[PDB]
Amino acid sequence: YTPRTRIAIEVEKAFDDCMRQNWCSVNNPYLAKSVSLLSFLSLNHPTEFIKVLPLIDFDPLVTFYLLLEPYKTHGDDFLIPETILFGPTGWNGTDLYQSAMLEFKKFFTQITRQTFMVPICYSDPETVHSYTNHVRTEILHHNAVNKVTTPNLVVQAYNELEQTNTIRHYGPIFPESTINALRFWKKLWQDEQRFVIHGLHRTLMDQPTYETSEFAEIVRNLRFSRPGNNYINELNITSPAMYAPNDRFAMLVAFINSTDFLYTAIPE
């Protein structure tokens, strides 16, 4: 449908293949494209590499969709601009692989001070997880766990990081490039997608037998329910306006309790 859609469909057909042929190697074409894209900005646009590095996921399938956003047709707030991806100086999806899993893991090793040369995500990413632990304890153990209270508290934590770049009033967590790229509850939209796609991907890979029906449901989720056209109204588990309902609240408690809550990338 678009150049963004073309690469995704090719990767999805390649993933459906590798799963059938030999269960791939975790994510196989998603890993190649994630690393291909992740080596391109590192070599060619270090400011955009710095902007999105704290947001990359160890699940390369999740990283692929959070970076490309191939089904986003509404808005011009792509995480990485269309010019950098498909323009005359664009990536256009050309493979930049060799030792792909080695290359992917080495990307997380780059979350350091020297790479930025300062946000706490680059200086002390372990300390950022300490701050998010405090917020997690505050919401789940220091407040009422209600349909009325908990959804509002999750948005407030993302709100503080959005406009003040702080967690527990300690900052700066991210670069300002990263902050302005996550305006209007986009990070909460990213992190619910993390939690949802993580669960279905983990389930897909844990099963004995591969069935294309389950991989299609993951793709159907990213196309029709979380395409990226409108972040706050694509919120489901984390939407306070949405509060079957207690099943939804169950995933909210699990999301806060997960590492996808206020997600930040760390070396290991």
Residue numbers in the entry: 11 to 127, 139 to 264, 274 to 298
Give me lines lifted from the publication on this model.
Herein, we present the crystal structure of ASFV structural protein p35 (304 amino acid residues) and explore its potential role in core shell assembly. Membrane-associated proteins such as p35 may serve as a docking scaffold for the recruitment of host membrane and other components in the core shell during the virus assembly process and further stabilize the mature virion.
While the high-resolution data were collected by the cube-like crystal grows in 0.1 mol/L BIS-TRIS pH 5.0, 25% w/v PEG 3350. The ASFV p35 is a compact structure composed of eleven α-helices and four 310-helices. The structure of p35 can be described as two lobes of helix bundles, termed as a larger “head domain” and a relatively smaller “tail domain”, respectively. The tail domain is a helix bundle composed by α6, α7, α11 and η4. In contrast, for ASFV p35, the two lobes are linked by three loops, rendering it as a much more compact structure.
